[PDB]
Amino acid sequence: PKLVTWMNNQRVGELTKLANGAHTFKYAPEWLASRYARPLSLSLPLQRGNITSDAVFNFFDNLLPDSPIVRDRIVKRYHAKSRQPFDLLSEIGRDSVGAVTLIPEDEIMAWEKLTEARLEEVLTAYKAREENDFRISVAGAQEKTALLRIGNDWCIPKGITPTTHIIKLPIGEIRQPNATLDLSQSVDNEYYCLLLAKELGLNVPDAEIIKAGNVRALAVERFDRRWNARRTVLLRLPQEDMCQTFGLPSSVKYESDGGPGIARIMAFLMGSSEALKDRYDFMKFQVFQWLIGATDGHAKNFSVFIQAGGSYRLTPFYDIISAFPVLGIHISDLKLAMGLNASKGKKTAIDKIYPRHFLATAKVLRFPEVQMHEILSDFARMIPAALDNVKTSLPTDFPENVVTAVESNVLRLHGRLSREY
Numbered sequence: 537p538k539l540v541t542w543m544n545n546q547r548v549g550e551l552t553k554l555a556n557g558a559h560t561f562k563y564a565p566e567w568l569a570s571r572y573a574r575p576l577s578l579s580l581p582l583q584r585g586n587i588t589s590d591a592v593f594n595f596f597d598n599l600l601p602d603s604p605i606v607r608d609r610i611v612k613r614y615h616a617k618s619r620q621p622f623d624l625l626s627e628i629g630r631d632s633v634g635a636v637t638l639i640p641e642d643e644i645m646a647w648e649k650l651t652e653a654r655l656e657e658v659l660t661a662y663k664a665r666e667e668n669d670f671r672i673s674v675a676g677a678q679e680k681t682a683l684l685r686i687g688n689d690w691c692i693p694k695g696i697t698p699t700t701h702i703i704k705l706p707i708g709e710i711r712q713p714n715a716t717l718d719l720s721q722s723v724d725n726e727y728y729c730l731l732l733a734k735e736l737g738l739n740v741p742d743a744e745i746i747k748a749g750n751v752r753a754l755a756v757e758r759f760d761r762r763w764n765a766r767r768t769v770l771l772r773l774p775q776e777d778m779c780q781t782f783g784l785p786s787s788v789k790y791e792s793d794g795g796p797g798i799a800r801i802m803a804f805l806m807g808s809s810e811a812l813k814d815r816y817d818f819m820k821f822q823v824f825q826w827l828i829g830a831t832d833g834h835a836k837n838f839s840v841f842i843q844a845g846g847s848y849r850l851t852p853f854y855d856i857i858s859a860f861p862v863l864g865i866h867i868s869d870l871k872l873a874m875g876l877n878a879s880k881g882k883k884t885a886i887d888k889i890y891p892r893h894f895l896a897t898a899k900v901l902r903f904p905e906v907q908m909h910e911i912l913s914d915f916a917r918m919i920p921a922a923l924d925n926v927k928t929s930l931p932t933d934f935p936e937n938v939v940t941a942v943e944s945n946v947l948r949l950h951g952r953l954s955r956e957y
């Protein structure tokens with residue numbers, strides 16, 4: 537009933553699942569005495585006592601896919617004891633996001649180099665009614681994996697060996713009453729959004745489209761990993777998402793479900809070690825998501841690195857998908873995951889948002905108006921050249937419809953900035 541918790545080669549504490557199923561956590565006395573001791577989560581501050589709050593269960597549950605559908609698939613794939621975090625983490629808690637390595641109280645750098653055939657088998661095994669909800673991430677079947685890149689080969693790590701890339705497969709088609717959100721090209725969609733963010737100077741990871749037999753996937757370099765100089769040891773870097781940092785369950789990752797939004801995260805970022813820039817980047821990213829029709833910027837898509845002493849700062853942005861390629865669904869149906877608190881009520885309708893809304897929200901959040909104008913002015917001037925630069929760099933087989941759909945819609949919205957800047 538115990539998973540000993542390690543951050544790379546240092547023993548941090550232990551997660552216990554009691555007979556009644558409660559999850560509790562205790563820090564190791566030696567870790568608490570560690571020179572650069574930091575908490576496993578900002579929701580689990582360093583303390584000597586046994587921690588029994590729900591933040592324990594929620595933190596570890598947040599390390600697993602939040603979709604019940606995927607969980608069952610995982611439960612069956614490894615024959616876990618239950619859908620509970622402890623039982624699923626007892627099987628796959630060796631390599632997750634951040635630096636939490638869990639080892640059953642019971643029981644490196646090794647891997648299996650995959651061949652063209654093995655790669656396809658491995659990836660194909662992960663790929664294979666709705667409502668007036670246009671959210672991409674619901675009780676969906678979308679399940680991403682991870683691989684270890686060694687030299688010029690993709691590999692499956694063995695033991696506690698980490699991975700270097702998050703692998704994402706096509707989302708497929710989400711069907712509702714009288715329509716269907718065609719997300720069969722989400723791999724190319726995300727690749728393009730990541731290139732665009734990068735071109736605009738936003739902090740995001742590099743990614744490449746990988747092709748194995750009949751599989752077309754996105755390999756996103758992980759920023760919660762770092763190789764030593766000899767490329768012989770891959771270390772994990774502590775990080776957690778906004779649900780974890782606030783001690784919330786993944787159930788509330790969307791603001792529309794009671795989750796955190798811009799105001800809570802902005803307040804929390806005042807405590808960042810680089811508060812000034814993190815708040816600026818976070819606000820700049822809200823304008824970016826508006827421009828690109830990104831409707832899935834929920835709380836689990838923003839994370840912080842936990843640094844020595846509990847110090848923290850924003851990680852790069854990630855999991856960016858535009859809803860524009862879905863239109864065919866109306867533009868007026870697109871809503872941001874986190875609304876702009878104006879005064880008369882949060883605004884989420886992308887087609888109804890203009891620069892005045894960002895300035896108004898900035899004012900309420902005490903985000904310097906001069907900074908907001910700087911952000912808006914930058915996109916006013918750079919968007920067109922950025923789109924053209926990104927387009928020119930796309931691969932030979934990139935889907936034209938995706939480019940066209942995103943370009944045209946960004947340009948339409950950019951018109952509202954160029955009119956004021």
